[PDB]
Design an enzyme around this catalytic site. Sequence first.
Site, PDB file in Angstrom:
ATOM      1  N   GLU A  79     -36.504 -14.018 130.272  1.00  0.00           N
ATOM      2  CA  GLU A  79     -35.602 -15.176 130.025  1.00  0.00           C
ATOM      3  C   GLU A  79     -34.179 -14.804 130.457  1.00  0.00           C
ATOM      4  N   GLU A 121       0.796   2.272 110.950  1.00  0.00           N
ATOM      5  CA  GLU A 121       1.540   1.760 109.765  1.00  0.00           C
ATOM      6  C   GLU A 121       2.727   0.908 110.231  1.00  0.00           C
ATOM      7  OE1 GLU A 121       2.175   4.928 106.832  1.00  0.00           O
ATOM      8  OE2 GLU A 121      -0.016   4.888 106.628  1.00  0.00           O
TER       9      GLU A 121
HETATM   10  N1  LIG Z   1      18.814   7.759 108.488  1.00  0.00           N
HETATM   11  C1  LIG Z   1      18.426   8.268 107.322  1.00  0.00           C
HETATM   12  N2  LIG Z   1      19.329   8.934 106.561  1.00  0.00           N
HETATM   13  C2  LIG Z   1      18.930   9.443 105.387  1.00  0.00           C
HETATM   14  N3  LIG Z   1      17.727   9.400 104.817  1.00  0.00           N
HETATM   15  C3  LIG Z   1      16.858   8.734 105.597  1.00  0.00           C
HETATM   16  C4  LIG Z   1      17.117   8.156 106.822  1.00  0.00           C
HETATM   17  N4  LIG Z   1      15.969   7.558 107.324  1.00  0.00           N
HETATM   18  C5  LIG Z   1      15.053   7.780 106.411  1.00  0.00           C
HETATM   19  N5  LIG Z   1      15.537   8.491 105.337  1.00  0.00           N
HETATM   20  C6  LIG Z   1      14.816   8.922 104.143  1.00  0.00           C
HETATM   21  O1  LIG Z   1      13.586   9.479 104.546  1.00  0.00           O
HETATM   22  C7  LIG Z   1      12.513   8.525 104.338  1.00  0.00           C
HETATM   23  C8  LIG Z   1      11.745   8.382 105.628  1.00  0.00           C
HETATM   24  O2  LIG Z   1      10.384   8.007 105.333  1.00  0.00           O
HETATM   25  P1  LIG Z   1       9.242   8.355 106.398  1.00  0.00           P
HETATM   26  O3  LIG Z   1       8.783   7.093 107.051  1.00  0.00           O
HETATM   27  O4  LIG Z   1       9.673   9.496 107.258  1.00  0.00           O
HETATM   28  O5  LIG Z   1       8.112   8.881 105.398  1.00  0.00           O
HETATM   29  P2  LIG Z   1       6.617   8.433 105.059  1.00  0.00           P
HETATM   30  O6  LIG Z   1       6.283   9.014 103.728  1.00  0.00           O
HETATM   31  O7  LIG Z   1       5.741   8.698 106.236  1.00  0.00           O
HETATM   32  O8  LIG Z   1       6.751   6.851 104.892  1.00  0.00           O
HETATM   33  P3  LIG Z   1       5.592   5.768 104.609  1.00  0.00           P
HETATM   34  O9  LIG Z   1       4.653   6.394 103.603  1.00  0.00           O
HETATM   35  O10 LIG Z   1       6.311   4.558 104.071  1.00  0.00           O
HETATM   36  O11 LIG Z   1       4.923   5.512 105.939  1.00  0.00           O
HETATM   37  C9  LIG Z   1      13.184   7.251 103.804  1.00  0.00           C
HETATM   38  O12 LIG Z   1      12.380   6.582 102.839  1.00  0.00           O
HETATM   39  C10 LIG Z   1      14.463   7.804 103.172  1.00  0.00           C
HETATM   40  O13 LIG Z   1      14.247   8.334 101.882  1.00  0.00           O
HETATM   41 MG   LIG Z   2       4.797   6.955 107.702  1.00  0.00          MG
END
Ligand SMILES: Nc1ncnc2c1ncn2[C@@H]1O[C@H](COP(=O)(O)OP(=O)(O)OP(=O)(O)O)[C@@H](O)[C@H]1O
Ligand SMILES: [Mg+2]
Lengths: 457, 459, 459
Positions: free
Chosen positions: A60, A278
Amino acid sequence: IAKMRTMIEGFDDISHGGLPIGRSTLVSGTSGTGKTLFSIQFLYNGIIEFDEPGVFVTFEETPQDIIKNARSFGWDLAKLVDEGKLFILDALSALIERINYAIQKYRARRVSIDSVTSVFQQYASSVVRRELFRLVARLKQIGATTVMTTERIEEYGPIARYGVEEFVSDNVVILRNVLEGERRRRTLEILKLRGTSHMKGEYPFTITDHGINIFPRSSNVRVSSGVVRLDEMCGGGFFKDSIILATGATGTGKTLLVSRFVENACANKERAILFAYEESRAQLLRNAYSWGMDFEEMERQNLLKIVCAYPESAGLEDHLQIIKSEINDFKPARIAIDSLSALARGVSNNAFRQFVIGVTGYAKQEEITGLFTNTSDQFMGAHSITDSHISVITDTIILLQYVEIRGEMSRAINVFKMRGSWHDKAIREFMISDKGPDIKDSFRNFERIISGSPTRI
Amino acid sequence: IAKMRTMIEGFDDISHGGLPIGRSTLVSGTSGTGKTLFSIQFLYNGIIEFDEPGVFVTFEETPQDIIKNARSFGWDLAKLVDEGKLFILDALSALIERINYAIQKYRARRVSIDSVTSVFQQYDASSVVRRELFRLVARLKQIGATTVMTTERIEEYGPIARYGVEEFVSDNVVILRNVLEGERRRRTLEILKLRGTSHMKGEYPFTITDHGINIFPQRSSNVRVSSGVVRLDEMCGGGFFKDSIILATGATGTGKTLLVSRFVENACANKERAILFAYEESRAQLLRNAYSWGMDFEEMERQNLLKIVCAYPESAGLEDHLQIIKSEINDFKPARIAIDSLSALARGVSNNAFRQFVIGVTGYAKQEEITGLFTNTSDQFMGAHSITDSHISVITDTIILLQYVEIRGEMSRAINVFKMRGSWHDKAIREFMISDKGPDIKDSFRNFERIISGSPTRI
Amino acid sequence: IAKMRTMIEGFDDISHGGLPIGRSTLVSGTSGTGKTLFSIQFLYNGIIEFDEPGVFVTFEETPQDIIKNARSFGWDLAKLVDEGKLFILDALSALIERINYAIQKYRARRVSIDSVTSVFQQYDASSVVRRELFRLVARLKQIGATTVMTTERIEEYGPIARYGVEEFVSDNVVILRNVLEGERRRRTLEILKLRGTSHMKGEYPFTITDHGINIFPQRSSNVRVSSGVVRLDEMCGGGFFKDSIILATGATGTGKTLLVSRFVENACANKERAILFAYEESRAQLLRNAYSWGMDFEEMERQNLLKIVCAYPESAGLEDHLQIIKSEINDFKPARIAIDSLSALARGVSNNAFRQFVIGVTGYAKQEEITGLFTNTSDQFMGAHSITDSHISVITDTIILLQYVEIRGEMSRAINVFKMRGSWHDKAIREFMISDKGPDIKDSFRNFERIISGSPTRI
Ligand SMILES: Nc1ncnc2c1ncn2[C@@H]1O[C@H](COP(=O)(O)OP(=O)(O)OP(=O)(O)O)[C@@H](O)[C@H]1O
Ligand SMILES: [Mg+2]
Ligand SMILES: Nc1ncnc2c1ncn2[C@@H]1O[C@H](COP(=O)(O)OP(=O)(O)OP(=O)(O)O)[C@@H](O)[C@H]1O
Ligand SMILES: Nc1ncnc2c1ncn2[C@@H]1O[C@H](COP(=O)(O)OP(=O)(O)OP(=O)(O)O)[C@@H](O)[C@H]1O
Ligand SMILES: Nc1ncnc2c1ncn2[C@@H]1O[C@H](COP(=O)(O)OP(=O)(O)OP(=O)(O)O)[C@@H](O)[C@H]1O
Ligand SMILES: Nc1ncnc2c1ncn2[C@@H]1O[C@H](COP(=O)(O)OP(=O)(O)OP(=O)(O)O)[C@@H](O)[C@H]1O
Ligand SMILES: Nc1ncnc2c1ncn2[C@@H]1O[C@H](COP(=O)(O)OP(=O)(O)OP(=O)(O)O)[C@@H](O)[C@H]1O
Ligand SMILES: [Mg+2]
Ligand SMILES: [Mg+2]
Ligand SMILES: [Mg+2]
Ligand SMILES: [Mg+2]
Ligand SMILES: [Mg+2]
């Protein structure tokens, strides 16, 4: 019993050599399981590598439609018919004689029938058997390896439509497409191989432009993670063929460490692949630049490749294929998965365990340094690592723990374990800045820091 | 194998282009799944898109009924005999010849049949059906006119069709569902196979509306928007981000709705439109409690800047709710939206179905450059432990944790920026009070240990 | 009722002697369960054991195919016409008369039929089958030749046979299975009934290999063997016992594989053979990490004293793994074996199936007088709590618990002999360090409380 190679990535090892020569193999399954694909691919690869005459019987399905449908995988069956390599016979001892005639008209090697179940509408369980049996015997008499396609109603029920086909056929292959949590998973299995050995149980496969994709050193060389102290904590950085793991709570610094590790590749003119699951490029680029990393630059140098995708979109077996293909093309020095936790949600632990085994096995087989992150589902990260079955598969564990100090939500980095290498066994506190991580000293006058809520000693 | 774009929001992405050209697509499903609707839409979107003569073959229902039925989606029968764009054929080779005749008659390219399982009442055997069904598709293939075939099923997770043979005769198989889980029906569409082409496997949540079928399959600015609070704006390092998702988790009665109020107020205060999706209290209550904090939500509604959409989370499906948000956002076009709350929508819902929702809402909020503040009542006293056990706290870019702290035998509350993606933020658990003018974020507890638990001890 | 020994490893114990003499034994199972293999083996082990003329009746498959099929187990057809020991009858009273004729012809005592359900295609009713099936067994009973009858089943836990009547006509019923649980098939054999005799009830794990079917149904010396460590040997009171099972539990990266290395090293150091069954890392990695501790596993393999058998725990069944160990131990004949690790083999496996494994491995290790050191990664920070929640920690004679201890904000580890059956042992939790020459077991923590928790406090 000699085995005939099908050149199908996986099957060759699952059948221990291939399909039994002289005998007929049944390949049953539900609709869209890849019964027709397998049957063509058996013939195609057969005379596309061994040049061994093979004829395809069709019921078929117009021969044009087959050749057209086969063109989806960049195959020229018409070019194979324009050299007398393949033969499509459009469609009960009449067919048996015609099939025997065609076979000998080319001097047979392999044959495929799609489908015998469709040519049994008129014929009643016992009648199917008697006619099926007679067919099966009229092929072995010629001594030609035939793949027989058969239709199934249920994924976990009768082997064939009349439940008498499996007991006739010498070799039985079952192609599945089980739906669990609104997600389709293709699994292949060899039920029996009369007078030979084979791998028992089902094996996750996927259909791509390549066709069927069934999926069945240790140097002391060290590579930098991108943090001087982190390398000092690990005792001269990570290994160049190991699997690292960044486990921790949400917003600890897993994505930060991934970036700094992926950066350190392009810093040494080395290619890297970042598999995001993510956040998206948009946010990743901004967040990266905020830490003083030019991801856009790294992409402009053809050293970094960002591949973001929704974990709940494609299946786990599909996600792996995408990695393999992306790694096979770019040929990265080191890769990163952000994250495994994103690919585990709405999946079976058994189906997820096989995933991490595959990615790890393929990352170490190609000597690729892999940094996989994982969001812990508990505040005490020490307890989350123990519940993780992927934490025993990894060679290094970098755990990031939240520590409440003086009513402040501070963080702590610690090398949990480091296989065949010394590491620092101190829970060093760290802070994040516009440059990245600043791993300071470890909490000395603090007890029960593993809880995330310590006490001054 | 070329693809025919059906112009059905979602299907065009799940089918990787659309339906195969000159191939017979089957659409099976239980009664009320939305087969005819899909079948009409296929022809409808064919005519009024790329001037394609489409022929609808009827069987059980008459042209008048179908024409009248499709009038709920605002589709006229002016494409029927008034233009000659359609060809409703009221109702084996006798019919096939008619289809082959009408084909070249109007130059018909698109064809829809409903239902093909109703013309197998004279038979009872699958072998008799298979043979007659195989003859149909084959005849249509020769014409080279890619058609849609409707079939009916008894079970939602049983045989593909009534005779369990129609799927293996056809080349393309689409299965529409209406699965009932916890006295709640969820419409999911899946493409089973696509002979000679690729597609997306597994089921995809869809909804039926006045628009018909609604299948649901590099900016990132550093611009900062205010949260409604000054200390909080300073706690995050100059307010929240624009195209960012904020999450306020905490125990019941901590102040999630309070923060949502200020976030929505601050929008209308800057002459910006906002939408508040209530799911817990009603406009009545919300209006009262709002004013008690010194906020006139009625005033904000009088300025056509704030829109409140209250509804019971245990009435409509998650896919129904998402569509409502989308439509309400597409109509009003706000600067920022607020969901109060995700936890209320997660009650008696599959964790899979919830993740798909949040992804969809987060995805659409970030794509339309809309600041979203989603709330979520924690199911434990220790808020930190709730954040960890959440498949959404990782999806959100910012987390605002509100925690109860029993101090000096008093029920005091504490607020802390748990995380802030690509941004510095205050890493201190500072106590806050609520008054008749909003929150008063005071100072953190310097002389207290194990505050995360909620029952701390003086150091 | 006398028993005919089938010489099938396991069956002889499960059948309490073997099959009843002059009685008709039925063997039902799904396709690929291993019926024909059992049927051949029954005749094969009959001829080349107690010179018994056996007659195999074929139906679906030809003698050549069967002869060629049995060539995967290294069984020749020199017992066929070359000797007259066998009698392959290619294929109701017509056949029965032939069986009755061939019986006295070769003096045939053993008979095998495959398959009896394929000669009921001309019928469709169970009553028609029962009558014809009852007539067969009855006729064979008169001859007084105890035969094996093969039948096919649709379901693994459904009717015994295809017509659900063949079990009640026969006297002896054996059911071969191939149950698929978590994409892993487990071959289990069961004797349902044995009319007029006793047997073992319930299913028994078996495997098919080059040897065919492998059904799996007062020494205790005080001699002491070294563990590879001196302090550890002293901690146990002069090293471990010879025919004893040791278990090293702990969190991931504590030093389970390290101890396994020293235990295997110490064997080869005394010119004793050892086998290391890896399931986590690969030879490549193990070889590297070993040398880092000052151990040359390659050297030990060059002396034909150490053999490493690495394999994925999520590929083969527990019964398949046990057979591998048994065979690998039967070939090499080591002094001591090591499993790294049991936890890796318990991933996606029924707790019942696991216990049966460990019992089998422990039982075979103690029976062959082999020192076994099995490891097991604890699924909690508190190792003591993991030991308690284990159906194996009671089976092991010695338990070596490795615990992480956070002291002075450092991730230090502690080792302690949890228990030692019929032996004194150090009841102190002494801290240990790992260097480039193995472990350095230091002194216990005298001024620390709640060390079992892993987060202690200074006293
Ligand atoms: N420019 C910045 N200056 C200071 N601290 C920062 C800055 N950018 C991020 N952070 C800090 O570092 C963290 C970065 O989170 P990151 O995404 O690296 O971790 P993660 O645990 O993988 O996150 P998620 O679980 O949400 O995916 C922020 O939540 C904050 O506490
Ligand atoms: Mg992350
Ligand atoms: N280029 C491609 N890339 C990925 N997947 C593809 C591609 N082409 C086809 N497929 C998928 O592979 C499947 C294999 O189709 P095939 O005709 O082999 O199925 P089948 O099991 O024989 O179906 P049936 O028995 O109903 O005829 C298709 O249904 C489709 O889902
Ligand atoms: N305007 C509308 N707004 C909301 N829901 C609608 C609207 N129009 C139709 N529906 C819903 O969609 C359904 C459409 O029915 P349709 O005829 O498409 O289903 P079907 O699968 O073809 O049914 P049958 O089994 O009778 O052929 C209605 O029964 C109703 O549940
Ligand atoms: N006018 C007011 N004056 C003082 N405190 C108030 C006032 N209104 C509300 N509160 C405080 O705030 C709480 C309510 O805050 P809100 O409704 O934002 O919390 P929520 O966490 O969203 O609650 P729920 O979980 O019930 O939805 C009250 O229980 C009280 O503690
Ligand atoms: N040498 C071998 N090594 C490993 N496995 C083997 C070997 N020989 C056979 N097998 C396995 O055992 C099976 C033996 O099949 P056998 O004919 O005994 O089954 P059966 O139950 O009689 O089948 P049927 O239903 O067709 O009568 C093979 O299909 C294969 O799975
Ligand atoms: N050369 C070395 N120098 C110092 N310490 C080392 C060395 N090699 C390993 N270690 C320590 O030992 C650990 C590994 O020990 P081992 O592999 O025996 O543990 P395990 O508990 O079996 O691990 P897994 O659970 O990952 O299988 C490392 O994480 C580290 O702490
Ligand atoms: Mg097919
Ligand atoms: Mg309808
Ligand atoms: Mg509220
Ligand atoms: Mg057999
Ligand atoms: Mg180990």
